[PDB]
Amino acid sequence: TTADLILINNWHVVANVEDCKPGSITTARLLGVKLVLWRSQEQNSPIQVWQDYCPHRGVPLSMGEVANNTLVCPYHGWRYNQAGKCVQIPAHPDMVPPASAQAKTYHCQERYGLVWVCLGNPVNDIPSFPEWDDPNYHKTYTKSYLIQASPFRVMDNSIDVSHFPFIHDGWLGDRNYTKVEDFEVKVDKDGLTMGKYQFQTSRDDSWVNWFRLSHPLCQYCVSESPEMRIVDLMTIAPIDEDNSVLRMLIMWNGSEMLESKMLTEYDETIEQDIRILHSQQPARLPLLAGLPQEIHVPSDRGTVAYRRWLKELGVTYGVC
Amino acid sequence: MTTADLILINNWHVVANVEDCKPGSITTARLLGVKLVLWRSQEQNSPIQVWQDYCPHRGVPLSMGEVANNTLVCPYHGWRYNQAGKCVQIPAHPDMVPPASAQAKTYHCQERYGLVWVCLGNPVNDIPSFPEWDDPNYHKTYTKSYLIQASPFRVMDNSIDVSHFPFIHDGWLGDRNYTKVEDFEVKVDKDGLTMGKYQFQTSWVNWFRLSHPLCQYCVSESPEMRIVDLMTIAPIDEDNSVLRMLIMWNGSEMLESKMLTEYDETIEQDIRILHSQQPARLPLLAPGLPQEIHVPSDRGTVAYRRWLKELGVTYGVC
Amino acid sequence: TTADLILINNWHVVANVEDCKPGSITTARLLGVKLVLWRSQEQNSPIQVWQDYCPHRGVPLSMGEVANNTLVCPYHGWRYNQAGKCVQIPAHPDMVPPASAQAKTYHCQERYGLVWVCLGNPVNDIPSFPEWDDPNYHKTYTKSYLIQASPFRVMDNSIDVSHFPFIHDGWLGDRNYTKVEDFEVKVDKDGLTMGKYQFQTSRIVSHIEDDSWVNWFRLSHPLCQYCVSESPEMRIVDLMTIAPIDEDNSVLRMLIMWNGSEMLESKMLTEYDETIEQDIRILHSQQPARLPLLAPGLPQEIHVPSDRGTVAYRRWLKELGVTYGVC
Ligand SMILES: N=C1N[C@H]2[C@H](COC(N)=O)NC(=N)N3CCC[C@]23N1
Ligand SMILES: N=C1N[C@H]2[C@H](COC(N)=O)NC(=N)N3CCC[C@]23N1
Ligand SMILES: N=C1N[C@H]2[C@H](COC(N)=O)NC(=N)N3CCC[C@]23N1
Ligand code: FES
Ligand code: FES
Ligand code: FES
Ligand SMILES: [Fe+3]
Ligand SMILES: [Fe+3]
Ligand SMILES: [Fe+3]
């Protein structure tokens, strides 16, 4: 559709690299734009990410097929090379295709095993994830979670910490320890950082957490106990103003065998969050100024800072 | 889909049956485009709270929470709201007095006739009268609720209409062999709309009164017994209704199953018409479809449309 | 609904006559209008096509019943004769029904075994289909295909010929024969005509070696197409009609005739069913849903020479004043 510039000119994850096999075609949606992702059959071939649209008669290129190093539209068979240019119009095999005959292409980077996409001019870097190449850390990926909520509501819920003893009771919080101790929040040029805060729970029931968003739809979260360190990179694909795809990449320095339990814990807490997110009204995130206005208490300082940050960045897409 | 019409916002509407609201329970309803939460504490004889179904902290429906002692507890961060709607406890700051704004939006509620009546505005008018409720000679019964995809004013218009009886109610309220409708009287004044006595030839004498444009008090009488009912139409929005009937009669109590079946048969015969009617809003008088036609036997539905215009109704009409 | 007079003042197929038995009641939708089709029980009774609406309290007359030569509303039993005039108000059997007690009636004509309807004042005539009266030709009707696309996109796809060797590979074309030979197109007093166009394919309805086919078509009406497909061994003609339900939905029907053995009917229906469904898969996917007209978000349409017919179609639609379901 017509997102804002801080969104258009930023990188977003739209798929896992394992979803794009050689020779394959897959689809995604980002900020209202339909995307086609494709690869040739060659070893280690790159991923192309284009608007899913043939400009001849408006057919989705994702309904075609990969032939050699080209994507072929199914309707009249126009072939597009890896750079998106039409190289052949079969009805007129000796005709030079017109210059307008070209797919709209976008920037694509593989990083952390994820497929990152920028629909505009990539002025920002992909958020950093320092544990990625650390040999002491194993990795696992959650499945994708399609969520019927504004992406900025999804992230709001991920910055919120006082909800742990309620919807995450027995997982991330304790019904009997509801008080939220003071913590610090800074918004500056590194984005939003929420400082260390302790919360009592087993998954050894003492975990210190902090997290940083250099990017309003990506969160780097660190949770450390004396026994082990777990970090994750949470990415929210903003499908449109009202729908999101959540993905989490998780790394931990404990035993490799803990993987199956890691995914079960995340799956349980994510679905606990999704139940709330689908229920929230209005579905779009209200900024700081029918339905009453939002109320803020001191433990909301992080989510208040998020709303202030979004207003400062000029976000108008998926908010109110 | 909400209204400012005073005769609607400043009036009482049935949203539920009291049997559906047990102690410690949480139920939901919609009225005039507003989502409601109904809840009671676990105490015997506890009152029924009727609030907008909405936590002002982060906008979660309160109806997804639980009842704890005398409070409704939001599931997201556990804020606790007392029976008066005031937040009494915010668990992340156990010693803090909640902000004054930490309050549920509460509505007037009154139990009457075994029904839960709600006023979203300023309760000017009283709940409709139902004289037989106090008469120990009359048994009572409640139909199930009927959700109807039609304007509430179309639903009431169909309930004031009498000439359709020999057609869609053939064999139940009329007879296809006696289709002529005899003369009858209708009055609209300070007490609302009153339809005088009428009767249909078959092979029962009736009258009814509306003081409230979405409630109807019906009287039907035979030599054998007398039946009265209070039909209420909850206006969910401009295009959807919930119809309920409270039926009272002074014959044998054992007639209950048959009466419920007869009502069910004729109500469903009406719903088949109501769901099909075009346009869905009720057309008022003298305003790509032609204007309605009125014949003498439509005098009651004509008077109903005149009454709604005098009352200034704009919601659910056209 | 549309003010476009070329649509309102034209004829459109809404049913097959075989779908309208004596005494029957059926429904259809046309240009946003809900229709009721009904016939008396008498043999050879005419077909009435009315707005599906009782002017008393707004009930669909299609929910009623046919009694003698009247259609009876189910709600209060008012009876409407074949001309749409209410002749009986059962609540007041002696009253003179008011002049307003009258169904909205539309012009209806049966032609080629199809039910044609005009919602307005018919300027144009029903398109002509010369082989209808030729006794050398056998006929068959496809079933009706409901398509979630603009009627003008559906017709665009039927005027298109370069797509045959791709989505009709193995049926109307050959992935080894993708070049589209030159052909002519005219927009004039006859409407839109595509001149003879030869293409390479063997077909299920003819001999293995009979693989050089020649197509031709004419539209005098923007949503009906008369197509002729001819080889040295056989000649096949069809009348395709597209009923514009609304701006975004259409019903396609095809009446097929051929100068050959009546035994070929099953293979004829198989070929048309296979190819129509291949077209529908594309039609459902195209964006935007309305047909973009010519004009020197989404990029603009690109045109190459083999698009000369679909370009002429878009030009013709602007000359005719079409605004419904386009752009
Ligand atoms: N499902 C979730 N589990 C939690 C873990 C805690 O962090 C770590 N690194 O274990 N990760 C994470 N990103 N957050 C943000 C909100 C709470 C949570 N969401
Ligand atoms: N289904 C319906 N049964 C009838 C009964 C009247 O019968 C009694 N016994 O009061 N109740 C009622 N509200 N009305 C209004 C019109 C006809 C009717 N609708
Ligand atoms: N599904 C379709 N089958 C075809 C038949 C004859 O076509 C051929 N090529 O024999 N009839 C017809 N009107 N048309 C227009 C487009 C192609 C076609 N659509
Ligand atoms: S629509 Fe893609 S080649 Fe024609
Ligand atoms: S949303 Fe209700 S307590 Fe936070
Ligand atoms: S609505 Fe058709 S007869 Fe009354
Ligand atoms: Fe959570
Ligand atoms: Fe009725
Ligand atoms: Fe085709």
From TrEMBL, chain B:
Protein name in UniProt: SxtT
InterPro entries, alphabetized: ARHD_Rieske_2Fe_2S (IPR015881), Cholesterol_7-desaturase (IPR050584), Rieske_2Fe-2S (IPR017941), Rieske_2Fe-2S_sf (IPR036922), VanA_C_cat (IPR044043)
Native organism: Microseira wollei
Key word Iron-sulfur present: yes
Annotated Fe(3+) binding sites: H164, H169, D270
GO MF terms held by the record: 2 iron, 2 sulfur cluster binding; iron ion binding; monooxygenase activity; oxidoreductase activity, acting on paired donors, with incorporation or reduction of molecular oxygen
PANTHER family documented for this protein: 3-KETOSTEROID-9-ALPHA-MONOOXYGENASE, OXYGENASE COMPONENT (PTHR21266:SF60), IRON-SULFUR DOMAIN CONTAINING PROTEIN (PTHR21266)
Annotated Rieske domain residues: 13-118
Keyword Ion transport: no
Keywords: 2Fe-2S, Iron, Iron-sulfur, Metal-binding, Oxidoreductase
Chain residues that bind [2Fe-2S] cluster: C55, H57, R58, C74, H77, W79
